[PDB]
């Protein structure tokens, strides 16, 4: 047997805003957070735009001294974690601190501060490198720093499963609570890969939209004119909590995390299989974990990256899993608005899945002007769609063919 897991706190930085309510307001209004990148010369790059976090003030969270030590991806993670802990109302004590852990991940982590330290290293050699360089750059430091600032003494770790990180972090945090290893986890991921190596690195694989003339139109999942994903920055954090623990302290509960699914495609390094066999197993695995028949799913937050091979794989996967129900469920890609936050994607997208339940509204897929061949599902093109949502899936399909699925349900 098993303990039930509920969402009691949520926090976020996105290209749409500096917290959940402002980001969600963007999602439902079909607003784009995509813009040419400022403060960085991208002249020599085939992509010149993305989702940046706009107007971020780290000193709302940290002294300027402790922020100088930390890559932007750590800052962003800590912001979402702090938002989420505050949102939860949870009081940490000597009595419960050993039962409260953190699992915040990143796809690449401290790329920006690595890039800035290479400069120092080749020009001037090793003596300029900062003392805080290693601890200020490694992925596990969001979990490290948050545990120290808050006195969290419970399972302390970080996933890095590329674009699946946020989904795997939340999912395996849930498992820690379900199986009695913790009563509370702060879980999700953060990403800031908007640096020469990120844009350059993805640019070299021609994985990125090159639609420099219309950055708001670049992210157009399931549309025949899409030409790869948009690179976006930010963070999601949820406070996961055991149900009796949450009820006892009178917490506001958003939704129940009822299921977690993992799988491997075991196919290709970057490209899913045409038929989404992997994503289909992962989804089947998640619904079984939740004890739910596929018919009961109402909303799917797709991966929906706006890559040609990835979007079509997800359609195949859903038709396969849901058969006669695949047209009844609504499925949108919020990346149409936010772009791809990589290891943070599944975190912000689990929050969007939780709010979709709170507000009975399916977020739009904007720019879905001309569906491709076989993209005839309910993809919620252009505008939000109010509707019944008892169960919501969030999907993440990553490099290595690492799949993750979270199943949320209305709580009462």
Question: Within 94-113, which residues bind ligand WJD (CB under 6 A)?
Answer: 107-108, 111
- Is 349 an interacting residue with respect to ligand WJD (CB under 6 A)? no
CB 285 → ligand WJD: shortest distance, Å? Answer: 22
Kindly indicate which of the ranges 172-180, 184-192, 233-241, 382-390 contains the residues binding a copy of itself, using the contact rule CB under 8 A: 172-180
Kindly report the backbone phi and psi dihedral angles of residue 376, in degrees, each rounded to the nearest multiple of 5, phi listed first: -105, 15
- Is 147 an interacting residue with respect to a copy of itself (CB under 8 A)? yes
Q: Which two tokens stand for residue 344?
A: 């943070």
Which residue in 145, 227, 151, 228 sits closest to 190, CA to CA? 145
Q: How far apart are CA 117 and CA 362, in angstroms?
A: 43
- Is 21 buried (19+), middle (13-18) or exposed (0-12) by CB count in 10 A? exposed
Nearer to ligand WJD, 302 or 329 (CB): 302
- When binding is defined by CB under 8 A, the residue of 13, 85, 158, 246 that contacts a copy of itself is 158
- Is 52 an interacting residue with respect to ligand WJD (CB under 6 A)? no
Sign of torsion, CA 150 151 155 157?
positive
* CB of 119 closer than 8 Å to CB of 275: no
- When binding is defined by CB under 8 A, the residue of 263, 305, 332, 333 that contacts a copy of itself is 263
Kindly indicate which of the ranges 82-90, 174-182, 318-326, 359-367 contains the residues binding a copy of itself, using the contact rule CB under 8 A: 174-182
Q: How far apart are CA 94 and CA 248, in angstroms?
A: 18
- Is 119 an interacting residue with respect to a copy of itself (CB under 8 A)? yes
- Is 310 an interacting residue with respect to a copy of itself (CB under 8 A)? no
- When binding is defined by CB under 8 A, the residue of 35, 54, 67, 133 that contacts a copy of itself is 133
Q: How far apart are CA 194 and CA 183, in angstroms?
A: 36
- Is 200 an interacting residue with respect to a copy of itself (CB under 8 A)? yes
Helices 277-289, 308-322: axis angle to 10 degrees equals: 50
Q: Which letter does DSSP use for residue 397 in this model?
A: E
CA distances from 131 to 70, 121, 127 (A): 11, 14, 10
Nearer to ligand WJD, 133 or 411 (CB): 133
- Is 163 an interacting residue with respect to ligand WJD (CB under 6 A)? yes
Strands 361-362 and 385-386: antiparallel
What does the per-residue mask of binding to a copy of itself show for 42-61, with x meaning CB under 8 A?
--xx----------------
Query: Binds 147, which of ligand WJD, a copy of itself, none (CB < 5 to 8 A, cut-off by type)?
Result: a copy of itself
Which residues here bind ligand WJD, judged by CB under 6 A? 107-108, 111, 133-134, 137-138, 162-163, 191, 193, 197-198, 201, 342-343, 399
């Amino acid at each position: 047997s098993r303990r039930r897991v509920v969402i009691t706190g949520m926090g976020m930085l996105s290209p749409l805003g500096l917290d959940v309510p402002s980001s969600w307001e963007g999602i439902l209004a079909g607003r784009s957070g995509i813009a040419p990148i400022e403060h960085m010369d991208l002249s020599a790059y085939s992509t010149r735009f993305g989702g940046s976090v706009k107007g971020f003030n780290v000193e709302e969270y940290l002294s300027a001294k402790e922020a100088r030590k930390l890559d932007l991806f750590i800052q962003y993670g800590l912001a979402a974690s702090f938002q989420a802990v505050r949102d939860s109302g949870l009081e940490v004590t000597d009595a419960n601190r050993e039962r409260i852990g953190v699992s915040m991940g990143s796809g690449i982590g401290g790329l920006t501060n690595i890039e800035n330290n290479c400069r120092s290293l080749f020009e001037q050699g090793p003596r300029r490198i900062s003392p805080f360089f290693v601890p200020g750059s490694i992925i596990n430091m969001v979990s490290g720093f948050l545990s120290i600032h808050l006195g969290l003494q419970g399972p302390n770790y970080a996933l890095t499963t590329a674009q699946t990180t946020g989904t795997h972090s939340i999912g395996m945090a849930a498992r820690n609570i379900a199986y009695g290893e913790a009563d509370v986890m702060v879980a999700g991921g953060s990403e800031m890969a908007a640096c020469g190596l990120g844009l350059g690195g993805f640019g070299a694989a021609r994985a990125l939209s090159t639609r420099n003339d219309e950055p708001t139109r670049a992210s157009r999942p399931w549309d025949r004119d899409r030409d790869g994903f948009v690179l976006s920055d930010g963070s999601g954090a949820l406070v996961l909590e055991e149900l009796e623990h949450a009820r006892a302290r009178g917490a506001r509960i958003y939704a129940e995390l009822v299921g977690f699914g993992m799988s491997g495609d075991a196919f290709h390094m970057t490209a899913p299989p045409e038929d989404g066999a992997g994503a289909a197993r992962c989804m089947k695995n998640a619904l079984r974990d939740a004890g739910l028949d596929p018919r009961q799913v109402d909303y799917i937050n797709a991966h929906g990256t706006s890559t040609p091979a990835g979007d079509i794989a997800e359609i195949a996967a859903v038709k396969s899993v849901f058969g006669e129900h695949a047209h009844a469920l609504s499925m949108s890609s919020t990346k149409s608005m936010t772009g791809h936050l990589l290891g943070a994607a599944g975190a912000v997208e689990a929050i969007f899945s939780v709010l979709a339940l709170r507000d009975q509204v399916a977020p739009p897929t904007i720019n879905l002007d001309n569906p491709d061949e076989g993209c005839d599902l309910d993809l919620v093109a252009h505008e939000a769609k109010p509707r019944k949502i008892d169960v919501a899936l969030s999907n993440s399909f990553g490099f290595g063919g690492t799949n993750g699925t979270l199943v949320f349900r209305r709580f009462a």
